[PDB]
Amino acid sequence: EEVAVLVQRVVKDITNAFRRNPHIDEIGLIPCPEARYNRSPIVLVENKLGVESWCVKFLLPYVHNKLLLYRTRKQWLNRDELIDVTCTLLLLNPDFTTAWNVRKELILSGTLNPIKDLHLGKLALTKFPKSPETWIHRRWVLQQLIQETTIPTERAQRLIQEEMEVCGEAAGRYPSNYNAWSHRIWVLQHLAKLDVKILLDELSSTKHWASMHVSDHSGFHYRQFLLKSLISQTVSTEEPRINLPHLLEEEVEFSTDLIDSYPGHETLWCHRRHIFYLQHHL
Amino acid sequence: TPQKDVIIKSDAPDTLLLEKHADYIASYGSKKDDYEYCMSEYLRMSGIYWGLTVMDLMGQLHRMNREEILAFIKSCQHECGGISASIGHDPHLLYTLSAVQILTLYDSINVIDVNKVVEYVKGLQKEDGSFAGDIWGEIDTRFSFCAVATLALLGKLDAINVEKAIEFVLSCMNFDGGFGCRPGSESHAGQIYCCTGFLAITSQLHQVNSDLLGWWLCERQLPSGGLNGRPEKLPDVCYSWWVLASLKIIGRLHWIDREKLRNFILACQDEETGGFADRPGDMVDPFHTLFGIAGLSLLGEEQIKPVNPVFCMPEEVLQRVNVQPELVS
Amino acid sequence: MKLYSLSVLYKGEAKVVLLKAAYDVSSFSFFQRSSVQEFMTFTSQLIVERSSKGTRASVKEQDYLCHVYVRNDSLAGVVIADNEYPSRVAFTLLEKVLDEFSKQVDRIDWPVGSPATIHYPALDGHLSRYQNPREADPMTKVQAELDETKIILHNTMESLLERGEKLDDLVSKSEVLGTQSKAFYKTARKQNSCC
Ligand SMILES: *C/C=C(\C)CC/C=C(\C)CC/C=C(\C)CCC=C(C)C
Ligand SMILES: *C/C=C(\C)CC/C=C(\C)CCC=C(C)C
């Protein structure tokens, strides 16, 4: 029908939307029953990218089927075309593993720049902040940025801090976002190598976040992880030794100060309960 | 403020609608919706498995097109031996397990190159005994389970480094007794199912503190009767499988509150359409429909076939293949 | 710990009147903020339409918690928060506003009030301050005679409606909700995650 050209126009509208505006915060769905005359469903307001709902029922299966044809070698696509379709495909359904795998091959072949995928996933995590495959792909991309060939490099800390931001924002959009906090932990293990400095900075900054999300056991587990990792590293940067029993008593105080303020939340109960385990085993 | 939990209404279902559930799964996908198909095709193979198993548990597997599915599965096998979620998609250990599970239900594992499947799974194990989802190296305890679950149904458990595989899973056990996706992860009822299922297959349940872990699992039950996966999470019917199956494996199922949980599961039915939602009054789907039925079967629902807590399949099916792991007495 | 809505109404004999409201739809997705704000307006009015004079109640929904205070002089005040936010601090905020509301606005402007006619710019000031209860004023005079624990609780907002009263017929019929907001409720596309 006319859908063949109405949709193929959109995949360029989205691609051109990124060239026009590099600083796009989030993507979103705009409630729209039917198409507006000669108006693209791709609406760019401020730093926000909107997609009118009427086109989604047409846009997705077009791009979806196009990638599968490429994967099965039923239809050839330019590497520029391949990037464009996978991009619009993953903004609609980031759980589509194969599309991510295709981009992996592009990155590994040298066609695609790894940073472009980080920013892509970052946008996808605004509409789908809990999408498992997105976090999975992120780990592969990050792992490729270390295999390029002690405190990690300056560029590494730039990436790590970037991971702390997206894991935090994704934790704010969905309550008890397991996959988000699990990724944040994974970063500190492989990207930061349990750096004593970063562990402390993470412990300090997230203390306020925990007070504003008391029912988020995933966030409080991150607290437990930070503390548990500090014990492993300590067996200036030598002060956490005397501070180790002090941080644990500060944490149990901070938790008690929340249970007395906000009773009922079993997370706070479970958190303190877990902190007790740390103090008893030293 | 009250605890975060659902409130079961009086007009909510309290009777097992076994027939309407069979009709729901049977008429699923009948509507020509291209959008919904594409959206969920990335896990379609697992979707088939959920659909067929819940029908077999109700003894209505015959209502499903055996031949059409068996063709689909044979098309989803690749050169590397792995099975993808659907035709065209990339192979993955998840849908490799789902495919084998389906072929086992239909007693036709020969439709697929069994030897290649074993090779694919074996080539996913790392040096530390962990398992990856595919060739891209994503590590998860789910994959450790999917590996041995696939091989056990093929009678090829000794193909992989069993001793080293067990070594890794035990390194994912947290102090609370639970398991995560990776070492140092937050305990998750779903991840616990995989690990307890793993250790059941590899015969290492003696490495599990049944009292401690069973305690953690029983803490998932809320005043409504429903179960969740983690502390302060809304009750979910799918977790009435992940939690119960773990309990049955470690031998602590009797600790749970039978009737209250049963009334929760039944309350998540749809009197009009059929199938189970995650909570009473929500949209239903084949996923929650299976684990709702499977949960009731574990609780002792006599209208439903006894389900194996490890492989999530009818016991009679796993009796034929001589694969029934010894559980904790 | 979040505050979504904070409005002051007047329960008349014929209809319920919106006088002044404050919103904070920043936590929501951008292109849905317009619709969400309208629902919180539609909700707050519907609560008062089912609330008797001189009673306190807390209507609970999934991941959302509404707190209503309808005084004896039919001056209603509704605050909408999440499940984390304590009800005691919610009713405390409702009381300190309704008292300072009669101080600045006369009682004769209540039955014919309007968001453009009523002069009360102290709502956004309080809504943003009472976000974190550990930063709010410690009014012990209010909380002393506040809670008799007679706060009626509701599992859903269906408990307020009649026996055969469908909520869907209250959404698509409302003149408060926009045409895209009515669709937003029907085309809610019920949540999917954990599949
Ligand atoms: C909300 C629940 C989710 C997202 C899934 C929780 C379950 C998990 C994490 C375990 C996954 C288990 C797998 C993939 C094994 C295959 C499943 C069965 C054999 C039932
Ligand atoms: C979690 C998402 C679900 C359950 C939707 C996808 C379901 C399928 C795919 C199952 C369809 C196949 C049959 C009913 C045989």
Swiss-Prot record, chain A:
Positions annotated as PFTA repeat: 82-115, 117-149, 163-196, 202-235, 251-282
TM ranges: none
Signal peptide: none
GO molecular function: protein prenyltransferase activity
Keywords: Acetylation, Prenyltransferase, Repeat, Transferase
Record keyword NAD present: no
Source organism superkingdom: Eukaryota
Entry keyword Repeat: yes
Entry's Gene Ontology cellular component terms: cytoplasm; mitochondrion
Entry similarity comment: Belongs to the protein prenyltransferase subunit alpha family.
Protein name as it appears in the record: Protein prenyltransferase alpha subunit repeat-containing protein 1
Organism: Homo sapiens (Human)
Residues of the full protein shown: 6 to 326 of 402
From Swiss-Prot, chain B:
Residues spanning the signal sequence: none
Binding site for geranylgeranyl diphosphate: 188-190, 239-242
Superkingdom: Eukaryota
Swiss-Prot/TrEMBL catalytic activity: geranylgeranyl diphosphate + L-cysteinyl-[protein] = S-geranylgeranyl-L-cysteinyl-[protein] + diphosphate
EC number: 2.5.1.60
Enzyme class: transferase
Protein name per the record: Geranylgeranyl transferase type-2 subunit beta
Organism this protein belongs to: Homo sapiens
Organism taxonomic ancestry: Eukaryota, Metazoa, Chordata, Craniata, Vertebrata
Swiss-Prot record, chain C:
Domain annotation v-SNARE coiled-coil homology: ranges: 138-195
Lipid attachment in record (S-palmitoyl cysteine): 194
Any single biological process term in GO: vesicle docking involved in exocytosis
Alphabetized CDD domains for the sequence: Longin (cd14824), R-SNARE_YKT6 (cd15867)
A single Gene Ontology CC term: cytosol
Alphabetized SMART domains for the sequence: Longin
Catalytic class of the enzyme: transferase
Database matches in SUPFAM superfamilies: SNARE fusion complex, SNARE-like
EC number(s) per entry: 2.3.1.-
Gene3D superfamilies on file: 1.20.5.110, Longin domain (3.30.450.50)
Modified residues (Phosphoserine): 159
Compartment(s): Cytoplasm, Cytosol; Cytoplasmic vesicle membrane; Golgi apparatus membrane
Variant or mutagenesis effect after changing residue 42 to E: Increases palmitoylation. Targeted to Golgi membranes. Targeted to Golgi and cytosol. Targeted to cytosol
Annotated Pfam families: Longin (PF13774), Synaptobrevin (PF00957)
Residue(s) carrying Cysteine methyl ester: 195
Domain Longin per the UniProt entry, residue ranges: 8-126
Post-translational modification: Palmitoylated; catalyzes its own palmitoylation. Palmitoylation is required for Golgi targeting. Farnesylation is required for Golgi targeting.
Membrane topology: Lipid-anchor
Domain comment in the entry: The longin domain regulates palmitoylation and membrane targeting.
Cited function: Vesicular soluble NSF attachment protein receptor (v-SNARE) mediating vesicle docking and fusion to a specific acceptor cellular compartment. Functions in endoplasmic reticulum to Golgi transport; as part of a SNARE complex composed of GOSR1, GOSR2 and STX5. Functions in early/recycling endosome to TGN transport; as part of a SNARE complex composed of BET1L, GOSR1 and STX5. Has a S-palmitoyl transferase activity.
Family, as annotated: Belongs to the synaptobrevin family.
Protein name: Synaptobrevin homolog YKT6
Native source organism of the sequence: Homo sapiens
Lineage: Eukaryota, Metazoa, Chordata, Craniata, Vertebrata
Gene this chain is encoded by: YKT6
